[PDB]
């Protein structure tokens, strides 16, 4: 921070006696079940280099954890998102550049418990008989313990370049029903995936064995709202003031079926078996200061 | 946040230099036990490309737990609330356009220990009779402790579109007695659903064995508050400024019984078996910046 | 907040460029023990649709947990408060509006333990005359814990509408000495409810076997301190711009009765025995902007 | 809190626009070794219905722990601090009340964890003699853990009235040597109340066997400062603008007593033995806006 | 801090009344897979001693976490980087000084628990043919905990000189599947290098058997974003005001490669196999306060 | 703090309305790898007794951390820091004075956990030829657990005089792979001091068998960055207003040893074997307001 290196707080932070111009575009795609919000914000700061460009993508991806198919009370499946992506890029051509993004990749950690114990103890003993016993006996033992905080999403930087950018929050694993937590990869002999199986031996229809959507996490059926934040700058001197940058909103669908083995209910999951995809092409005028689609 | 990407903290917030205009709006459903409150903010910040208003949807809609039922000392029902909901719709004829709202969904999270332990152990035997004993074992384990902490109801933004958004404040799990928690599903063969028994073999009326509701979820009872926000765009050269919106807030009860075998107490419960619905429609005027119903 | 939604923080609060006029009104009911003290302030800001008025409730009442029966060495009774209450109402004739209040109920949470732990150790043996023995065995243990936090009272706002709003701090459960906690149900078929005894075969006479107040919530005895907010909204058109609201403060009070036994103390308590209500009325002057009683 | 309600922050506030008087008063009671501190502070803000007064009540009650009779090597007595006390009381003929106060009292809470654990285990014997052994068994428990912090001493706001308030702060128990804590009940058959025992059975003389006050509550031998506030309101139009207040500062001290009983030392504690009590007058001129004693 | 030796907080920091000019410069580093930013301030405060300029790197690197070799399908290479380097250095010739850098190397912690338990226990016996039998047994046991969190990167400033910074953050340690952590030494006779393996047994080709990059740290593959500050000092009587400096984006990769013995999956890592450096000359112009590529 | 005391924040620090000359000053010793950097600030406050000159001694010591010695493939030494110092120091005949520094020596606090337990257990035994079996028994525990938090190195301040003040970190002790923690006295029969040990009876060369500089404290190698201020006061009227003050930046190193005992490694650590010291006089004009080297 500043005060790290010894200098006035936000001394450096760019948009000081600059009037800034804001604006909000919204489009719903029916299709997807898409509400893609972008809010940005034009700081032509004269102190400063270059023209600079706030997009922050935002709105919201719908889930859509949903049965799909069944095909006999003895076999369903569900359709869940195991993926939402939002992506920014600019033309090959265009001038301006992709300059900064939050969020990033932040390290994760974990805590780890070493323990070691010594231990002696005796022991005499008898009988209504007269008899007299003895006992000695030592003891150690290595205990070794992990523990770490795991999300039931995972927020990713895409890797970026000056010409893109982009996010994707993925499913890593979920507890289901005080059990697991299970993952795209979970896999019992008997039962196979458990991920989102309710009952192991019920005795009802498939379509009617999922996990309750409440009972799971709520990005897989009402969705995950972006709060991403991109920033472009420009030369003001390059020749051409008008800038292209489509954006592209994504859900990425697994699917999980559940069959009746004639004795217990058994989990599959396919990955990546359906991809959403809403695009949208935005026009960025860095003269009038305003941004349109 | 703004200081991660280099910028002068609050410089692309919309508002300043502006005169915003706000209001309230009460309205109280008797028949449904609603207390309905709208709290209004027009913002027609200029160097915005579009108008704005904030509309916060509070109040609260009580909770009704209540035995409506009761067929004898053996037998009575109980109606709890399964579900709160807030939802404000924009006919599909409007050019104004929900843009964001908040409380969003949030990812969730839990914590994950796996533990190994190995030992080794010496033993030495004895009795007066000059007899000499041993002992030599060594063990080991594998434990994995899962930890996740559960609201008693969940806040769950819907799938929103640019004409609704809504919330549902969902029962998820409770705590009876120091016991559970318990959920809509619970079972037990002997008992059944024992969510809101207050004894297991107690002898007296059904319609008094219900848990006390000082003892259960206050929003059970007294009620949930909605605090939630929406907001919504609008074009200046829009040629109508007068936009319509409805506005509901609901509750879903369940119905929890209560009826003695011949030994004990057996608890069942039915989902979603009555909801209540107020719906309301205000006017939005952008030109004199009012709300009103 | 409104970060969360891109608009500076606190352009949509009421209250800016406005001259707030307040007061403060003291009343003292000795019978009843209340300590009511009304902190009022009138906000007329001309950007809001309404005239406001916020009431804050304060003072305190006593708790007066004391030992106020004696009925011979094996008898006494202990009278304390199970619930405290604050309430607000305008009468049916009233064009004026409760709006908000504060504070409302919150959900509740609880931490859950799940934990699966297996193993197997090995075990061989041997004594001074050439016998050899063994031993290899394995176990699995399963096992749940339930974590959550109680005060020792609930702070409930009750069910409001559009003319009333009350909240109740109610008795939720105690630690007795290192133990329990006790509620107002707690049943040993031996000493029945323990909430307040201090021993358990003491031999003294009975109101001297009763919790010290030291060792008890102070809200008990020396009583508990409301601070509630409440909103009222007027319309600057309303015929009449004056207003009357009552406002009642209420200790309920249980009966904790302690008989000896033949060989030890045993406890019980009455529910809600008596009802201490203290009631008084204010005049609102909505054009003058004081409030008086 | 006001942005609870929708309103700026510190918009109901007292002070503004207004010139606020204040003052020092120290006296030391000798004596009673009491060194007292009264800082106050008159806010007449006109668009308050009212003129207020803030008095904060200070410095510092010595605690006293002291051996204090002697009686040979076996017996020894010791004077402590069990409560330090404050009050503030204004003549019952006054027309000006007591408002608010500070600290008041607060709920306590307390952590309950239940468990459950269930455990199966296989075994298999075989000594060198070729006999093949067994043993199955299964296991089931069920634990509970009361989790609560508990401080040396308690701050409690006294039921106060429109004329008179107080608080007082109580020895609660004590941790002594890593053992206990111990309070003024604790009873062992064996040493009786150890309190304030050094040893169980040192060869010293008893006036030597108390212990340390270092290794005790700070409180009990160099004292608690106090810190509460009082605020008082006067109308403007009394006829009489002159209030006479008393303040009191209190010590009451128990009598911890050790005796060698030939084996071992054993300890006795008397309740409320001395009390120490310090008053003083005050005249606060309303007018004038100062305080003098 | 400055409130610790009595100063008026941020009274010693650099900047007030200053013009201060700042800057943005991306570079994409198309073969090495890297978005590289300098985000720079020139703060010519004439109150201090010295001109300055704060450089901060950014962008990002991305990881590359690949399966570049395959020898059949029983053995095959995975690339991942095991440092990520951001260095920055003035050719010796300059008279500007690197002065400061943020962040520094920071004290690590570690928690540790030392426990001594001692016991007793009887048993008395007896069968129904009238034996009987006692036992009286005693121990000691000695633990010791050791807790320390491990991230999974660390983030090291390299020792500096006034020509001459850097950061290096390097790969420290990882959770694979629950297990572990495991590092670039991990050994296990059989299985080897466990660090990125999938399966121990699996029968799936080598180029298939390696750890999902979605459930190893996100900066093994999407990558890291550096986020460095560099301040230099300049005199501002320095005869040549322009200065050279390189700016350096380093990604060490190890090699990690999995072969099928015969009857399982051994893994073996290879230290610094590759490195991938991406230099930079830019041009900073103290008098003219700019940054230029 | 100000307010604990009635204060207004902030009214007794020094600094406001004055004018702050500040200065860098940056030195790289080659020879000791040491970047030494002072930034002073001279505050010349009119309502202060004296002028003032807080000095912040920055920069950062190199580890050097380092394999020096190779005699033989049994046998080797490593240099490593156990002492990072810097130290100020006015010469005798200056009238200038050390009157603040910070940070400072806090007070280090511990938690201890005393635990008493007791139980009982009944055993019924019973088989095939008739036998029935009892059993009953009792025990007690008592057991203490020492929990406390150790730095790797420890920052303490030495014991300044009115000329001279100066700090030291020194290392206090350090994980190694999960063991330890280990310090400068460690001593194991079999292994000797273990500090710096990679493998117990690791097969390779000596020089190869100390532990990997990334898997021990960063300060060991990269460097310690020293961030400590001394406030240095004069009087306006002293006859002399020039003040020398010498400085010195010193590392500390220990020489660890490993040698092959023809079955194992042992380790070895002799204390303090070298010292590098770095000085540097800077000259304080306090008319001037410069500080020069």
Same mark, same amino acid.
């Given at each position: 921070?500043d005060?790290d290196?010894?200098?006035k707080?936000?001394?450096t932070?760019i948009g000081s006696?600059?009037?800034?111009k804001t604006?909000?575009?919204?489009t719903?795609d029916?299709?997807n079940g898409m509400?893609k919000?972008?809010?940005y914000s034009?700081?032509d700061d004269?102190?400063?280099?270059k023209?600079?460009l706030?997009?922050r993508?935002k709105?919201?991806?719908?889930?859509?954890?949903?049965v799909y198919?069944e095909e006999?009370?003895?076999?369903?499946?569900?359709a869940?998102?195991s993926?939402?992506?939002v992506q920014?890029?600019?033309?090959?051509?265009?001038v301006?550049?992709i300059?900064?993004?939050?969020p990033?990749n932040?390290?994760?950690?974990?805590?780890?418990?070493s323990?070691?114990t010594y231990?002696f103890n005796g022991?005499?003993?008898?009988?209504d008989?007269?008899?007299?016993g003895?006992?000695?006996?030592?003891?150690?033992?290595i205990?070794?313990?992990?523990?770490y905080?795991?999300? @039931?999403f995972? $927020?990713?930087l895409? #890797?970026?370049?000056? +010409?893109?950018?982009?996010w &994707?929050?993925i499913?890593n !694993?979920m507890?289901?029903?005080?059990?697991?937590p299970?993952?795209?990869?979970s896999?019992?002999?008997?039962?196979g995936?458990?991920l989102?199986?309710?009952?192991r031996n019920g005795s009802?229809?498939a379509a009617d064995?999922?996990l309750d959507?409440?009972?799971?996490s709520s990005?897989l059926?009402s969705?995950?709202?972006?709060?991403?934040?991109?920033?472009i700058?420009m030369?003001r001197?390059?020749?051409k003031?008008?800038?292209?940058?489509d954006?592209?909103?994504?859900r990425?669908?697994d699917?999980y079926?559940?069959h009746?083995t004639?004795?217990?209910?058994k989990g599959?999951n396919?990955? @990546?078996?359906? $991809?959403?995809?809403? #695009?949208?092409?935005? +026009?960025?005028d860095w003269? &009038?200061?305003?941004?349109? !689609?």
């Amino acid at each position: 921070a500043d005060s790290d290196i010894n200098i006035k707080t936000g001394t450096t932070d760019i948009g000081s006696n600059t009037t800034v111009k804001t604006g909000d575009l919204v489009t719903y795609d029916k299709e997807n079940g898409m509400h893609k919000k972008v809010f940005y914000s034009f700081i032509d700061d004269k102190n400063h280099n270059k023209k600079l460009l706030v997009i922050r993508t935002k709105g919201t991806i719908a889930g859509q954890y949903r049965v799909y198919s069944e095909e006999g009370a003895n076999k369903s499946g569900l359709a869940w998102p195991s993926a939402f992506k939002v992506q920014l890029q600019l033309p090959d051509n265009e001038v301006a550049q992709i300059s900064d993004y939050y969020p990033r990749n932040s390290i994760d950690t974990k805590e780890y418990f070493s323990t070691l114990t010594y231990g002696f103890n005796g022991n005499v003993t008898g009988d209504d008989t007269g008899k007299i016993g003895g006992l000695i006996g030592a003891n150690v033992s290595i205990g070794h313990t992990l523990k770490y905080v795991q999300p @039931d999403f995972k $927020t990713i930087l895409e #890797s970026p370049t000056d +010409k893109k950018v982009g996010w &994707k929050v993925i499913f890593n !694993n979920m507890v289901n029903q005080n059990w697991g937590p299970y993952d795209r990869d979970s896999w019992n002999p008997v039962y196979g995936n458990q991920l989102f199986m309710k009952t192991r031996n019920g005795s009802m229809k498939a379509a009617d064995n999922f996990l309750d959507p409440n009972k799971a996490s709520s990005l897989l059926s009402s969705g995950f709202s972006p709060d991403f934040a991109t920033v472009i700058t420009m030369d003001r001197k390059a020749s051409k003031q008008q800038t292209n940058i489509d954006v592209i909103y994504e859900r990425v669908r697994d699917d999980y079926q559940l069959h009746w083995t004639s004795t217990n209910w058994k989990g599959t999951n396919t990955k @990546d078996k359906w $991809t959403d995809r809403s #695009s949208e092409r935005y +026009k960025i005028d860095w003269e &009038k200061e305003e941004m349109t !689609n």
